[PDB]
Amino acid sequence: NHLSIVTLEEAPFVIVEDICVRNTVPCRKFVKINNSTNEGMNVKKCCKGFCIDILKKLSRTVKFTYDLYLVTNGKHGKKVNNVWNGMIGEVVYQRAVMAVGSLTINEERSEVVDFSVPFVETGISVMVSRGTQVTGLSDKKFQRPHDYSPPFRFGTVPNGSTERNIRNNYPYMHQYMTRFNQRGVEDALVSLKTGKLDAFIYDAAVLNYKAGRDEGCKLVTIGSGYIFATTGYGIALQKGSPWKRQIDLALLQFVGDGEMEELETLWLTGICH
Amino acid sequence: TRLKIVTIHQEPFVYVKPTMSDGTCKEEFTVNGDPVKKVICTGPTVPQCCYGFCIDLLIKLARTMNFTYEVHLVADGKFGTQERVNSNKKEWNGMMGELLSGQADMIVAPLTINNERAQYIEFSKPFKYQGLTILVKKGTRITGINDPRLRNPSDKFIYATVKQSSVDIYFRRQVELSTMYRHMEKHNYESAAEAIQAVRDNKLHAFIWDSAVLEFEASQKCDLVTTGELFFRSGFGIGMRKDSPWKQNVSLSILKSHENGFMEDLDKTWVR
Ligand SMILES: N[C@H](CCCP(=O)(O)O)C(=O)O
Known part of the structure; x- marks a missing residue:
């Protein structure tokens, strides 16, 4: 007991x-x-x-x-x-x-x-700066980034389950986004807020929490209906x-x-x- | 073996249509070219055609775990709550009653996971996460669950849910909802379709129900809108009796399907 x-x-x-x-x-x-x-x-x-x-x-x-x-x-x-x-x-x-x-x-x-x-x-969510329009991980902007000019700048924190899921489900997206790997969540938030990154893909509960307390309320997550996995x-x-x-x-x-x-x-x- | 599956009519999770004259299901594709897999389901009994999110899920589960099945619609048309008899005894109605009595081996439906039901049956991990919202006709203006016309009810503005559903239980059990519940219990409907039709005909002014269903209805019928916000979050799970040999693998299959984008496909095909 x-x-x-x-x-x-x-x-x-x-x-x-x-x-x-x-x-x-x-x-x-x-x-x-x-x-x-x-x-x-x-x-x-x-x-x-x-x-x-x-x-x-x-x-x-x-x-x-x-x-x-x-x-x-x-x-x-x-x-x-x-x-x-x-x-x-x-x-x-x-x-x-x-x-x-x-x-x-x-x-x-x-x-x-x-x-x-x-x-x-x-689940797998997406955070962007307010104004940027994406639906969720399965968005064509992520799946086929070179269909757009300029291509979307987006990354995740590597070596964990988010990366592993993307690698398994969207092999080209995975290949493309490694150049935008983020060392951690805090780094990614700053990259977004300073226009060095257009989207950060990560754990939904964590991103919701970070967006909820962002200074100036400038960072936004997708709606829960578009959370992947x-x-x-x-x-x-x-x-x-x-x-x-x-x-x-x-x-x-x-x-x-x-x-x-x-x-x-x-x-x-x-x-x- | 051969599992008896019980389900319930609830678009977009379960559609129910007549068979063709020869008793088969008409071949059909989605607007984007996906085949619509149909199975025979018997119900109020006459053989009929069933398809949708939950049917696609059943077919996936069946193939993955190598079982066969026969599908029927719940005889009383209800999801399932526990009610007093006559007796000190209590009894489950709806799909819950059929699972517990052995008339079904599995419930494959948008069945809300809650404490009340989990006392008696086993739920899989959720195959769908969603919540409760409110549906009104365009031109009706409320703020949501805390609007004064809801929190301070009268017969000028009628709101309700479906009888013998998890939403009914949700309102009966919470002391702070006691005023809302007393209004609703005078007005609850036999099924979601009837309540939805009633909102269109201005006989029901607000319908409190599952957002996965309401948002879909609002996306098809432009005279209907939702609040927007969920005021409570819940999940749908597969239901089995506690002695089921399938329960571990059903859950693993559901987790696998979320992770490999199978549920993403179902959401895009049926729910978005
Ligand atoms: N909640 C954590 C997962 C967080 C996301 P990841 O860093 O694995 O991409 C876990 O349980 O492993």
Whole structure:
């Protein structure tokens, strides 16, 4: 009844601070001595944010206690040569019973972990400067960029699931856009705002959050109806976990009764439209 | 085996048309050249022709998981809510009742995933994300769910949803909707088509329903418009009994289909 749970910092879903008090919960982080050793120190941190508030509600509703820790090998979860790292890895290799955070439900992961119902919608979205007109990832402007002059300047953050999806579904688009690879989201926002980039293709929940709080409300996302590969963030559990049904029912109860919306208002909804 | 599939009439997810005289389904293509795959579905019973988003999905699921099927329309015409008997007993009506009683093995329809139903059945991961909105006739002007004509109701302005649907449940269960619910329960309709026709004939002034359906209706019938905004987000899922041997692979198939652009194709063919 007391559970090992893993998370990962990604504001505003999981925000990590030094030590707890207030709306925070304790979370430990194994911090390495250097990059040539496995030796390290457990450090006390405090965690808060959208997914942490969900966890607090689940612990209460589903009646469990937990020890929360931050993942240290990789991020959300990537399968390299059939070996998982990140939060998915922690669950797969039974170091955690549950993973909580901005964790995208997909087929590859669902083969090795169980997911709860989605608690936040996401997928592949597009962000542009206000005034630019595109429909979504499947727009011909993206699929056949040289059909236009000048061609659209657009990129994503490489090496993750967004790139992988585009590579699989739109091979020419993938080939074209690598020249506009962005190091991270923050770099991409600046590129858009300074006219160095026309569109940034990325995770919908993240782009919605960034657009919601952009300074001057100059950045815009497509409508949710044009999100490609719609899915959600979900809680990952061990395959055949006894906790899945009650976690599923609780999340559906939270959504149905307005609790999820007030969490969204609290953490995700920005001043812009 | 051979799975019994229950569905319901609900364009653009399920269209229902007469067979040709020889009992087959007429061959038809979309405006952009896509074949329209049709299956025989029995219903209120007479063999008929069914096609649309949910039918294309069923055919994909069938091929992927190698099952066969026979499709029928829900006998009572309802989605499914749980109601008291006579008794201390409760009973599900609609597609929910048919799944639970064994008259169907799978529900393939725009069935909203909610806590009430998930207590009793298993839902796949969502095959479609959408929400609730409001449909009115052009010339009717409301701000949406918080308009005073909704939050402060009278019989001068009539609004409603479909009986024995998830939307009915959504309004019954929340204390802060208690005033709205009391108005609606005097006016709810037997089906979405009837409520939509009623809005066109100025007999219903606002219809609260699934945005995937309402936005489609508004895009075909220029005398109808929606609020625009969703006031609640929800998903449609495939429904199975909790002992179903198919449930894991149905969900994986749905996730696979979102990721490989199959659902994108269905959205463009049927929903956009
Ligand atoms: N939510 C993250 C995915 C974010 C998008 P990516 O950086 O993989 O293109 C995850 O669960 O892996």
